[PDB]
Amino acid sequence: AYRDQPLGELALSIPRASALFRKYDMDYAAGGKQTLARAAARKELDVEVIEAELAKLAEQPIEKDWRSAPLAEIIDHIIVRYHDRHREQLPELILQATKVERVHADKPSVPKGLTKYLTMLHEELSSHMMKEEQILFPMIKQGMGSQAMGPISVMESEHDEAGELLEVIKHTTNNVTPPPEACTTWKAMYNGINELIDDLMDHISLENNVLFPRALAGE
Numbered sequence: 001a002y003r004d005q006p007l008g009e010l011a012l013s014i015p016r017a018s019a020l021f022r023k024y025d026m027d028y029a030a031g032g033k034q035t036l037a038r039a040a041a042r043k044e045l046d047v048e049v050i051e052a053e054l055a056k057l058a059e060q061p062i063e064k065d066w067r068s069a070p071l072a073e074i075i076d077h078i079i080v081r082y083h084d085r086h087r088e089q090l091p092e093l094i095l096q097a098t099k100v101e102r103v104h105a106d107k108p109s110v111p112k113g114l115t116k117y118l119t120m121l122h123e124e125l126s127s128h129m130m131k132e133e134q135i136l137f138p139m140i141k142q143g144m145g146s147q148a149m150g151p152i153s154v155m156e157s158e159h160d161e162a163g164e165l166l167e168v169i170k171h172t173t174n175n176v177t178p179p180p181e182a183c184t185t186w187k188a189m190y191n192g193i194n195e196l197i198d199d200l201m202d203h204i205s206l207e208n209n210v211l212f213p214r215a216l217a218g219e
């Protein structure tokens with residue numbers, strides 16, 4: 001009965017359900033408590049079609065269940081797979097945007113402002129990830145999460161803010177769709193933005209749907 005399960009649960013139990021949700025712009029990362037039925041109702045989408053899509057994906061076995069992994073292992077994975085990867089992706093994308101805005105400034109379809117908006121995202125992310133790595137994650141590792149509800153809600157507010165900056169980047173790039181005039185840098189950059197959105201959503205999902213709720217529950 002997938003329509004009745006929360007998005008976050010579905011994304012964690014069905015391999016690549018996250019990619020299905022991305023296609024429909026369903027926020028499983030910050031909106032993970034919503035039922036699929038609700039999220040579908042909000043978007044005016046046929047849930048039965050989405051349920052069939054999920055059933056086909058569930059045919060693949062699941063590769064690794066983060067729902068049961070120890071919190072310290074989740075944290076080290078976040079740092080290596082997501083935090084450090086964002087520290088490399090974003091500056092690359094900023095450089096590519098700088099060049100595109102420079103060279104194609106006079107094309108009517110150029111994504112004007114993209115360099116600044118990627119830089120804003122990068123700046124918010126850098127300070128956010130440092131708070132996590134230096135202050136919050138160490139306390140969660142020592143089993144102190146159930147006394148950290150204040151801090152954790154602050155981090156979830158910051159995840160929501162990063163979500164808003166993603167929407168701005170989407171808006172500036174026509175939902176990350178290159179015009180017919182785009183060169184290979186411009187196309188590659190848009191592919192990299194999509195990759196960044198994928199990773200960021202999986203990163204935030206892992207924190208909002210697994211790490212933080214388990215830590216608050218006393219792990």
Ligand SMILES: [O]
Nearest residue numbers: 128129132207
């Ligand atoms: O994060």
Ligand SMILES: [Zn+2]
Nearest residue numbers: 078129132207
């Ligand atoms: Zn993080």
Ligand SMILES: [Zn+2]
Nearest residue numbers: 128132155207
């Ligand atoms: Zn975070």
